[PDB]
């Protein structure tokens, strides 16, 4: 029932210091080794290092030894990674993982993984526009409600519907890279056509790098 929750900025300017924190719930830091792994989008995993949960012992990747630092706060039951002199080669999805205390190196519990982007551009919150229900494309008496997420500089944007209550029929498409460097995506959801007027639909957009949280209701524009 171990739960790892990752916190930290999504955007880091070059030559700055990236700082990530893995908070552990349902278990203590002691009794295990705690590791940081990173995966550049399109590549495989790379081991950054781990820290002992009981003692002060830490081990790092030799290729990253001079820039990375792992620490732990036992009072808050969490650990942390910091990477100095960050460049574009450090853009990746960062996971925290658990490893048994023994001298074996298998990772069985992983965190969600926070995307970290190293760019000189500024963060831009998303503009969210509802997409009125269209039934020409959908089949068997159902419509498709949409939400368009336009012009947000970092990549991770999460979209849910009805505060996570509506899950079936939801499809969030991969984002597009505008010529201005900003990202845009669309989240569509197929709903029963005979339920448009009686059921309210709200798309929840969360863009954590800009700390922006919008909730746009998709009301029927035409009929």
């Amino acid at each position: 029932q171990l739960q790892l929750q990752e916190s930290g900025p999504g955007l880091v300017k070059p030559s700055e210091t990236l700082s990530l924190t893995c908070a552990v719930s349902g278990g203590s830091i002691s009794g295990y080794y705690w590791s940081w792994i990173r995966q550049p989008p399109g590549k495989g995993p790379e081991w950054i290092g781990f820290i002992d949960g009981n003692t002060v012992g830490t081990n790092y990747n030799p290729s990253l030894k001079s820039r990375v630092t792992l620490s732990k706060d036992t009072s808050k039951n969490q650990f942390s990674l910091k990477v100095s002199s960050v460049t574009a080669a450090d853009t990746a999805v960062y996971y925290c993982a658990r490893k048994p205390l023994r001298r074996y190196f298998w990772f069985d519990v992983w965190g969600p993984g926070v995307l970290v982007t190293v760019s000189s551009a500024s963060t831009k919150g998303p503009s969210v526009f509802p997409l009125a229900p269209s039934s020409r494309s959908t089949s068997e008496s159902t419509a498709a409600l949409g939400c368009l997420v336009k012009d947000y500089f970092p990549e991770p944007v999460t979209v849910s519907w009805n505060s996570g209550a509506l899950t079936s029929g939801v499809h969030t498409f991969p984002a597009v890279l505008q010529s201005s460097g900003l990202y845009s995506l669309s989240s569509v959801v197929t709903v029963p056509s005979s339920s448009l007027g009686t059921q309210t639909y709200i798309c929840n957009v969360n863009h954590k790098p800009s700390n922006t949280k919008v909730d746009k209701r998709v009301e029927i524009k035409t009929c």
Partner: peptide, 25 residues
Amino acid sequence: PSVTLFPPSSEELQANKATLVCLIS
């Protein structure tokens, strides 16, 4: 492929963020 074409709304029209959305799945 299934194709869904969303036209712009007045919201994005008056904000000059009007865009056609073509979803393919």
